[PDB]
Each structure stands twice: as C-alpha cells, then as structure tokens.
C-alpha cells in the first residue's frame, strides 16, 4: 500500500 | 453559547432559504447561537418591521432580515439588512443587495454571513473559502478523485481523478493552484494542478517519499517531504527557480510542515523524541526546536495565519483528539469530541477547523469551532474522505 514508511504519520498507510 | 442573534427567513416557495444559510454560517463560527426559527418572536420583512424590545426581551441585540426577489431573466436579487435592537434600536448596522443567478444563491447567502459577521466581531469571515480533499470511490479505474467544495460540503466539484492513490493537497495563497501527492506513476510523485485549466506541474518525484506539500503564505516558496536520504527529512522549493534546499538532516522522520506568517520558519512532525512531537525550524538557520510539551503525543499541526496558535492531533492519556496550542504560552485546549480524529485544517480567520474521524465509517468530515463551542458532520460523501485542506481567503 502508498505510504510514506513513517510507522505514524498521516501519509503512513492512510488508505489501508 | 455564543452570542445570540435573531437571523429571519427571507421575504420571497423561494428557490432557496437564505436565511436558513446565515444562520448555519454564524453558528459553525461558535460565535454565535442564532434563535430556533420555532421560537422567533416575529418574522419582519424588512427594517421597518422588526420590533426591537420583543427581540431584546430574549437577550438579542442584531437582527438579520431580507428579501429574495425574482428578476425578469430569471436571476435573482438577494438584499439583506441588520437591525440594531440594543442600544440604537432599529438602526440599520449593515446592509447589500446584489443580483445573482440561481446556481449563486448559496453564495449570495455565505457574501450576508461573511458581512454580518465582520459588522458585529471585526474578524473577516470565511463564508465563502473552500475545502479541498480526497475521496477514494467504488469505482474501479479511478477510485481516487481530488475534490473541491464550499466549506460547509455543498457545490463539490472534481479536480482530478486517478487509478492510484492520492495524498495531501495543499492550497497556494492566491487561491489557484493545489499541490499533492500522486502514485499515478507507480510510486509517490509531487505535483501542483492549477485549478482554472487542470495543467499539471511536475515539482518532485525523488526515490522512495515525496508527500506532504505546503505553500509558503508570500506565495514564494513550496515545504515537503523527502525520505530519498534513508528518513524522511524537509526541503524547501523557490518556486521561481525551480530549486530545492535541504531543510532538516537526520536519521529521525520529520515531516508534514506547515508555514508560520512570516514565510520564513515551519512547525513538522518529528519522531526525533521517540513518539511525534511538533517541532519549529527555520527554512535557513538549521536547528530545529520542540514546541509540543503537553500530553504524551503531539502531530500534523497547522499554524494560524496569525501566529498566535496552532491546531494539532493531541494524545493524553490514551485519547486522540483535534487540540489548540498558544504558541505563545503552550496552553492547550481539546476541541473535538468524535473517535479516530486526524488531520485538522483551519479556516483562513482562525474560527473553524476541519478534519477527519469515524463518523460515516470514513465517509464524512467535521467540523469544529476553535472555541470549542460548536460540532458538526459535513454533508456526506460517496466514499472515503481524507486530507481536508481548507482554502486560503477567495
Ligand atoms: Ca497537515
């Protein structure tokens, strides 16, 4: 899934 | 709470209720509580009809009324007066009128709240400002569309849709373009849409994170997130030039920034303490300071245009909720109530904030007075709303 690879922030896996 | 005003419906069934439409702006500011329209003492169509002492006997002192009138070609005038029924009784504090055609009508309503609004707390209103965010669809070739619409949810129109996720649009201070983040390539890209012609600049697509975008407020310059390095750290683009500068430099995760006035300083989210914090630094003196003290967490902040405070995603004791913080003090104070809040953005006035939570399962944004005082569900959408992004002043 897009993400940003935080573990946290908003842009971290925010569409499941 | 809030201060109580008599808001009528307007003299014309009428194509649309705008006085229905003030009401609903005035109360969303938390400023104020206008009477039920079951309990109003009269319905004056004018100045000359409205009572003041039946209105000051229920401890209000303005009045809003006005009229909704046809034009031969099939526009409309819409005019509105506020009545003084304090202590100049019966005078008229503000007034307009102006011609608009059906699909403005709601407009015309937000252009009275905006001025009865600025008239009696000398804050501009923000009425008549946008939201932008992103909603993931049932359809099956483009599920992620980036949308546009007023700030109360209604007049919602698409900016553009895409087979891959979308990310985190950010509005430019004039109004006209949004930039975002895209996985339309097949990995994260950063782009900036004007919004008038739909063309497309490409600003960033550098391996691994490119997300998170911010205008400065001078228009100058765009903050983002870059993770090419190993973590995700700052950079700042001159828009004019097309160059990029290196913001923040570490091994930690440092991201979402958001401008301060000055055009020259961000808070961002950092991991640098263990669990995020928000943190200040300057786009060129590079040191970056925590601010966020209270609670156990504290991130995606948005600075008021101001610089007085902040909003932010605020964790004590097991709770996250949409928090307020003096930037000046450090006082914090909780402002929403609803499960799984996230992603707050503020009102170009500083009186609202918008965000995300479980309300619909996903489908619905909320909003939030900065006063804490009053609550709502936007209308509902088809899908999954995230990322609000609440306009600049238009
Ligand atoms: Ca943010």
Redesign the pocket.
């Known amino acids: 899934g897009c993400s940003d690879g935080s573990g946290w922030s908003?842009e971290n896996n925010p569409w499941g | 709470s809030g201060r109580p005003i008599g808001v009528v419906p307007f003299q014309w069934a009428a194509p649309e209720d705008i006085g229905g439409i003030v009401a609903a702006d005035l109360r969303n500011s938390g400023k104020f509580n206008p009477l039920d329209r079951a309990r109003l003492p009269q319905q004056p169509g004018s100045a000359q009809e409205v009572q003041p002492a039946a209105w000051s006997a229920l401890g209000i002192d303005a009045v809003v009324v006005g009229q909704v009138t046809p034009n031969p070609d099939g526009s409309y005038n819409v005019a509105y007066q506020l009545v003084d029924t304090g202590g100049a009784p019966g005078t008229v504090l503000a007034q307009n009128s102006y011609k608009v055609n059906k699909q403005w009508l709601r407009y015309a309503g937000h252009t009275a709240s905006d001025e009865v609004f600025e008239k009696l707390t000398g804050i501009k209103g923000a009425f008549r400002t946008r939201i932008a965010y992103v909603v993931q669809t049932n359809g099956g070739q483009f599920p992620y569309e980036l949308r546009v619409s007023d700030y109360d949810g209604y007049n919602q129109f698409v900016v553009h849709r895409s087979p891959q996720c979308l990310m985190?649009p950010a509005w430019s201070p004039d109004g006209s373009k949004l930039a975002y983040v895209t996985f339309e390539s097949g990995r994260s890209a950063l782009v900036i849409q004007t919004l008038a012609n739909g063309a497309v600049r490409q600003v960033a697509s550098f391996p691994r994170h490119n997300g998170?975008p911010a205008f400065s407020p001078d228009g100058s310059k765009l903050a983002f997130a870059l993770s090419k390095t190993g973590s995700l750290n700052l950079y700042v683009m001159d828009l004019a030039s097309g160059q990029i500068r290196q913001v923040t430099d570490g091994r930690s995760n440092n991201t979402?920034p958001?401008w301060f006035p000055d055009s020259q300083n961000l808070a961002f989210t950092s991991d640098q303490a263990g669990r995020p914090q928000v943190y200040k630094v300057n786009i060129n003196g590079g040191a970056p300071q925590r601010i966020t003290w209270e609670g156990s967490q504290n991130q995606?902040?948005?600075v008021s245009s101001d610089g007085k405070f902040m909003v932010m995603v605020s964790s004590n004791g097991g709770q996250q909720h949409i928090a307020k913080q003096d930037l000046a003090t450090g006082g914090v104070q909780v402002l929403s109530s609803t499960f799984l809040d996230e992603?707050?953005?503020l009102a170009p006035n500083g009186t609202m904030v918008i965000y995300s939570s479980s309300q619909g399962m996903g489908s619905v944004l909320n909003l939030v007075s900065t006063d804490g005082r009053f609550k709502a569900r936007l209308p509902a959408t088809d899908g999954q709303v995230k990322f609000p992004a609440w306009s600049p002043y238009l």
């Open positions: 908003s | 985190s998170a979402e958001t995606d902040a948005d992603t707050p953005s």
